[PDB]
Point group: C2
Chain length 142, copies 2
């Protein structure tokens, strides 16, 4: 079992890099055309799901109390995000951006899974949901 989960782990690290490498390539032009970097794009993607504060973002991101403060002020100056700890939500324009990001992904994902059996995907998705639940739970403890 040792060489087993270790193989799964090695495999998942590779799958994650390939997903990141492919995502960056498919979004280079959009970010280019919106004047934002990959890093700022990943921040808009986090806020497409829930309104966050520099505090939250920093925890999920990593060691960047200032690098986050900067990136967020830059997003505010580009009017891609807005305020209401502070109320950091997406502006209408950051939403247009997220809609054009989803539409680009959704499209190649669709063509890539058109043949999958939804009953099988559904079982796989439940398993990953439980693991996701345990990762988030463990992240909370310590």
């Amino acid at each position: 079992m040792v060489r087993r989960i270790e193989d799964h782990i090695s495999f998942l690290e590779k799958f994650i890099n390939d997903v990141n490498t492919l995502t960056a390539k498919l979004l280079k032009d959009l970010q280019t055309e919106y004047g934002i970097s990959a890093e700022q794009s990943h921040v808009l993607n986090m806020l497409s799901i829930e309104a966050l504060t520099v505090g939250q973002i920093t925890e999920k991101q990593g060691v960047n109390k200032a690098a986050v403060s900067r990136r967020v002020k830059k997003l505010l100056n580009a009017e891609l995000v807005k305020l209401e700890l502070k109320i950091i939500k997406l502006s209408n324009k950051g939403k247009k951006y997220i809609k054009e990001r989803k539409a680009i992904m959704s499209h190649i994902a669709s063509d890539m899974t058109s043949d999958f059996d939804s009953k099988e995907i559904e079982k796989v998705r439940q398993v990953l949901e439980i693991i996701d639940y345990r990762i988030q739970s463990y992240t909370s403890k310590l």
Copy 2:
């Protein structure tokens, strides 16, 4: 069905960020113990797979023409990397094995209660996806 594939992509992205988040917190002390930052640790990660040069590294990495050359310099001076042809040293490999031990122990604990065939089904689905992604980034 377009709102279902969107849900899957979002879930998939959320899963990946949760893993990256957890991975960062689990390794901070070890990275700290070795005198390196998370970003220099990513360069070791790569070199753990295959010996590379600043060429391969900058690409996969992404946007980083000289920010990568720097992290390498620091790793080279730390004696984790070794020299063109950039490889890991026996000290760099000791960091990767200890990294592997921390991750493997956590991953197996979160997974020990699953049926081996359930995990294999997940593995097969992800392999087919990774197959198709590599095949795609291959084209353009």
